């Protein structure tokens, strides 16, 4: 006759940051881009949840953790990672026919 409810929450928070430096030049026939730059990334996640058993009224209106008369459990943990990145890119086009 098991009745229970689990209220679960999760958060994923990612952010990114970069700076970019690019030069262009058009010399009669030569064309050319250069670009160097740097990028940072970071994700931090968290999740947790409260679990409760045994409810007298069996509707989502009643079935909140505060109103259970049985056993409880608690869950959750976090994690994350970060990335650093250094890059450059170089484009060249001769006479608009060799790239």
């Amino acid at each position: 006759g098991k009745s229970a409810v689990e209220a679960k929450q999760e958060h994923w928070t990612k952010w990114m940051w970069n700076a970019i430096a690019t030069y262009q030049l058009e010399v009669g026939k030569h064309r050319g881009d250069v670009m160097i730059g740097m990028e940072l990334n970071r994700e931090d996640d968290s999740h947790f949840s409260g679990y409760k058993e045994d409810f007298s009224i069996l509707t989502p209106d009643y079935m909140w953790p505060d109103a259970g008369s049985g056993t409880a459990q608690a869950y959750g943990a976090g994690e994350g990672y970060s990335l650093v990145s250094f890059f450059g890119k170089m484009n060249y086009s001769y006479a608009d026919r060799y790239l």
Binding site: L40, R42, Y81, S82
Partner: peptide, 13 residues
């Protein structure tokens, strides 16, 4: 470049 990729470490283990 370096401190950035070491900050986050294993959680709950």
């Amino acid at each position: 470049c370096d401190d950035f990729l070491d900050r986050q470490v294993p959680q709950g283990i």
